[PDB]
Amino acid sequence: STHEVLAIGRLGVDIYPLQSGVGLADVQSFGKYLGGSAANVSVAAARHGHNSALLSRVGNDPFGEYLLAELERLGVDNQYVATDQTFKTPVTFCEIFPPDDFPLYFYREPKAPDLNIESADVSLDDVREADILWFTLTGFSEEPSRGTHREILTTRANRRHTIFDLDYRPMFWESPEEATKQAEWALQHSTVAVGNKEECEIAVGETEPERAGRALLERGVELAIVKQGPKGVMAMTKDETVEVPPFFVDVINGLGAGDAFGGALCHGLLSEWPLEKVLRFANTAGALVASRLECSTAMPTTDEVEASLN
Amino acid sequence: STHEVLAIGRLGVDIYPLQSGVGLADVQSFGKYLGGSAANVSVAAARHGHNSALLSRVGNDPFGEYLLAELERLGVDNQYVATDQTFKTPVTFCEIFPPDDFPLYFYREPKAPDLNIESADVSLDDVREADILWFTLTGFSEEPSRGTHREILTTRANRRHTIFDLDYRPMFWESPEEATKQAEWALQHSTVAVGNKEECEIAVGETEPERAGRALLERGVELAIVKQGPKGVMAMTKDETVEVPPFFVDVINGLGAGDAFGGALCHGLLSEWPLEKVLRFANTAGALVASRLECSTAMPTTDEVEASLN
């Protein structure tokens, strides 16, 4: 029981509005879906036909039971999602103001189950053997998950591919300095790094994309992916720098666009494709999720991404 | 500005299912309502035409701003609902399994704004002069709310009517013994106590409604109201013992039925009705909320209760 993609990190219930363009005071009803970045990435990888697993936790409650069943329904192995005996399954609300404004309201207090992960919760054989290990900067925000991440990544030993989502949300950290310290350690144990401008700033102290990628490769990462929003997205190795323009769509809900990108990145890397094709494929996958109201339930299949790739 | 009913305690957003008889895993959409027991009692009192106010707080977020606007839309003076600068507006979920099972899932972590109330948040003149002061045992569960309740109840000096809802939620306390200790002090500073069997057990160590009522009178209240479920309600004074049977209805969501009862009890006391009329009216009011999916928006008017009685 080795997996192609072993993702580690956030899992929770998204309670999102069923009317768009209204603030929470005007929302009349909300839906319910599986979410959390790491969980979304494990789903997106599964939708590309890969055998995918998530290391996370849920609470000992009906929302946690929901998420465990939904992961399996969406094609993700849930065997490393333990039930926490103390903390509640987190909920996240949002507002939906297209094209660019999707405010998030996290209820992850006082600690999310997903930040209570123990290396006991996972097979370290699978950690070593997995084709891809996917993890987040948020995973280093609190103990015991920080120490667990360090154990996992030490034993992982920078095997191809070990993918670091630079995932910076200031409200999850005591300070930017705290996040940078952890990101620096994690970069030295990663083969791929993915972040936007704020994220790359936190991780390597570089606002400009080309300097960002260079700073990331200096840590020993062999593929830097710098998301640029307006200017699109760049992929950099020691052998080549590739850039792709933004795939323009009618955005319904942009939340989790980057997780579908991350899942599609995993597929392109497992497929051994050229870097330009990986980045094109990943870039299109994220736009497809952004063009729908849903995320975890709406993750694009490989045929839907290949069709849209023009 | 003196109110007829000054309620103190919890206030939150109810995120309740729009489908009944299904667990959270099978709920497809949720509504968004003002809720919290003291907030509900203030709304219920208002719907019987009484001038009512709530001492509580909200978080500095869109859900808190909603609750400020919803209180006022529902006819309750929000002047004593301050915006807490630290903690988030709480949300509560439930499952709706009639006739008898309405489990609650509170997100009140690490602290609810309502438990951060300070004596400076309220007019102490209104505390002293309001016809009815209504408070909950949950208000004693944490500081500074505990201290605030103490200061308030000391200055009120047991004037008619000072109403103690024995409101016992085990998860809000470190132990039942800590709840009992606070309930003994509150009972010495109250004129009316209202609770179900389990709440009377916590408060005075009696489960049988006649012994509980005598025990509550010995602690110093003038009127003990023991709710007995399908066997109705008992009211006891030093001169009088009265039992009223329930009002039969097809139950959808029993949540908030106690709160409708409380607002209706406020109306009966303010009207100086005989005890048996007060209980019948209050039982019917509770039964009508029990009949509906909604809680705060389903609090009945006096004419609606009258129509059900007649």
Side-chain angles (χ1 to χ4, degrees), chain A residues 1-99 101-210 212-305 307-310, chain B residues 1-196 198-207 209-213 215-310:
Chain A
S1 186
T2 298
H3 293 90
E4 286 172 275
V5 177
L6 173 48
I8 306 170
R10 269 196 307 303
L11 167 66
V13 181
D14 289 345
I15 300 292
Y16 286 4
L18 291 165
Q19 303 81 55
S20 293
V22 299
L24 292 177
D26 296 318
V27 171
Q28 305 297 306
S29 64
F30 295 95
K32 175 197 99 258
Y33 286 138
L34 177 149
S37 185
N40 288 337
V41 170
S42 71
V43 175
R47 285 284 81 70
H48 298 300
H50 300 292
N51 180 26
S52 294
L54 184 67
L55 168 55
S56 187
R57 292 180 172 196
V58 299
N60 187 14
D61 51 41
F63 278 146
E65 291 178 296
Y66 163 64
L67 293 176
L68 289 173
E70 184 72 354
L71 270 175
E72 172 138 8
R73 194 190 72 73
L74 295 175
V76 179
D77 189 341
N78 72 8
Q79 68 176 285
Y80 312 129
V81 186
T83 299
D84 201 82
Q85 307 300 313
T86 301
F87 303 112
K88 305 170 203 282
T89 303
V91 299
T92 307
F93 304 82
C94 78
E95 300 160 323
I96 307 176
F97 298 107
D101 186 19
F102 316 96
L104 288 158
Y105 304 94
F106 283 97
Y107 285 70
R108 289 169 61 78
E109 304 280 26
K111 187 186 276 185
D114 64 63
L115 293 171
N116 229 33
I117 54 158
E118 295 178 338
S119 61
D121 298 349
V122 77
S123 162
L124 297 176
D125 289 328
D126 199 12
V127 164
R128 291 190 288 85
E129 296 299 300
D131 298 85
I132 292 181
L133 189 74
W134 182 284
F135 75 99
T136 72
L137 177 57
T138 293
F140 295 74
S141 65
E142 296 285 8
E143 295 290 4
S145 178
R146 179 180 299 169
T148 297
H149 278 72
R150 287 162 169 263
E151 183 162 19
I152 288 174
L153 294 168
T154 300
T155 199
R156 181 70 183 170
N158 303 44
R159 281 176 181 78
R160 286 179 59 96
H161 312 268
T162 301
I163 306 178
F164 182 12
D165 181 6
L166 300 175
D167 188 51
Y168 180 66
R169 296 198 73 85
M171 292 179 279
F172 290 174
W173 293 86
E174 292 293 312
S175 69
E177 292 70 31
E178 199 204 1
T180 304
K181 184 144 92 169
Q182 299 301 317
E184 282 166 359
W185 190 94
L187 283 168
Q188 295 166 331
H189 303 84
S190 294
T191 71
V192 185
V194 192
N196 72 10
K197 290 183 165 135
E198 186 183 345
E199 288 169 338
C200 293
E201 180 58 22
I202 289 294
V204 298
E206 293 294 347
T207 189
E208 298 305 318
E210 200 86 309
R214 275 187 282 265
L216 291 166
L217 294 182
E218 189 56 45
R219 270 49 157 194
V221 157
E222 70 205 334
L223 177 53
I225 295 171
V226 177
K227 289 156 146 173
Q228 299 168 40
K231 285 224 170 196
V233 53
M234 172 197 81
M236 181 181 216
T237 68
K238 57 147 162 43
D239 294 312
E240 98 200 282
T241 290
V242 174
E243 190 152 23
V244 178
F247 204 75
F248 297 117
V249 309
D250 197 357
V251 185
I252 301 188
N253 186 355
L255 294 159
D259 304 330
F261 176 101
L265 174 58
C266 294
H267 174 79
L269 284 169
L270 293 161
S271 297
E272 317 176 80
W273 290 339
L275 194 64
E276 194 178 303
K277 183 143 141 73
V278 175
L279 197 63
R280 281 171 178 283
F281 188 87
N283 207 33
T284 298
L288 284 168
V289 162
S291 70
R292 305 182 237 190
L293 177 63
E294 305 84 18
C295 176
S296 62
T297 61
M299 285 303 189
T301 62
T302 300
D303 293 331
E304 208 207 61
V305 184
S308 291
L309 195 135
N310 290 301
Chain B
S1 180
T2 296
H3 297 84
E4 297 178 85
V5 174
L6 176 50
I8 318 179
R10 67 181 172 284
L11 169 64
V13 180
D14 289 346
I15 306 292
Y16 285 5
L18 293 172
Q19 302 79 48
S20 70
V22 295
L24 290 187
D26 289 306
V27 167
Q28 307 297 335
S29 61
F30 299 79
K32 186 198 87 289
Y33 317 88
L34 172 137
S37 183
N40 289 341
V41 169
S42 80
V43 176
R47 299 271 262 271
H48 295 298
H50 294 297
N51 182 19
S52 72
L54 175 66
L55 171 56
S56 192
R57 298 187 166 192
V58 300
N60 187 13
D61 48 40
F63 278 142
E65 293 302 333
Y66 163 69
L67 293 174
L68 290 179
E70 188 66 3
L71 279 161
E72 182 173 344
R73 192 187 69 73
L74 294 172
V76 178
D77 187 342
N78 69 14
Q79 68 173 282
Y80 314 131
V81 186
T83 300
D84 195 87
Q85 300 300 306
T86 311
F87 302 109
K88 307 171 195 288
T89 300
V91 302
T92 307
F93 303 83
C94 78
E95 295 165 312
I96 300 174
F97 293 118
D100 40 24
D101 183 37
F102 318 101
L104 284 159
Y105 308 93
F106 287 101
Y107 284 72
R108 287 169 63 79
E109 298 305 328
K111 198 182 199 167
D114 67 60
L115 292 172
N116 244 17
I117 55 161
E118 299 170 29
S119 64
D121 292 358
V122 72
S123 169
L124 295 171
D125 285 350
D126 201 3
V127 162
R128 293 183 276 265
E129 298 174 56
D131 299 79
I132 292 179
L133 183 87
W134 177 285
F135 70 97
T136 69
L137 177 55
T138 291
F140 289 78
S141 69
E142 299 286 11
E143 297 287 6
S145 179
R146 179 184 294 171
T148 299
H149 280 73
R150 289 172 173 254
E151 184 176 2
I152 288 170
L153 288 161
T154 307
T155 205
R156 184 152 179 95
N158 294 44
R159 71 146 281 171
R160 280 181 184 160
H161 310 269
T162 301
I163 307 190
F164 180 18
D165 177 359
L166 300 179
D167 179 59
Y168 180 67
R169 288 287 155 200
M171 297 262 69
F172 292 168
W173 292 91
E174 303 293 284
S175 56
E177 294 81 9
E178 190 196 12
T180 298
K181 174 182 145 202
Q182 300 299 325
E184 167 56 333
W185 186 100
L187 285 167
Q188 292 286 343
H189 299 84
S190 301
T191 76
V192 182
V194 188
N196 68 22
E198 297 97 342
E199 295 165 343
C200 295
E201 185 61 50
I202 291 292
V204 302
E206 303 297 337
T207 234
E210 201 189 350
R211 216 151 170 91
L216 289 158
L217 292 176
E218 287 174 12
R219 302 325 187 64
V221 304
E222 279 150 46
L223 174 57
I225 294 164
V226 189
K227 304 180 189 137
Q228 314 170 347
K231 222 169 153 73
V233 64
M234 170 188 306
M236 201 202 172
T237 69
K238 271 275 124 199
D239 204 10
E240 218 181 315
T241 301
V242 158
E243 284 202 298
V244 174
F247 186 79
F248 304 134
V249 298
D250 296 31
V251 178
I252 293 178
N253 190 359
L255 295 166
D259 299 329
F261 181 99
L265 170 66
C266 289
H267 183 63
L269 294 171
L270 296 172
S271 304
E272 292 178 87
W273 285 344
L275 269 184
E276 30 281 279
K277 187 176 186 165
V278 178
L279 283 51
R280 280 203 170 286
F281 189 91
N283 285 17
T284 296
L288 294 168
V289 170
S291 311
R292 282 178 274 185
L293 190 68
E294 296 83 7
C295 181
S296 62
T297 65
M299 297 290 136
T301 198
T302 307
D303 287 339
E304 277 150 28
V305 178
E306 281 191 43
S308 196
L309 283 165
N310 294 293

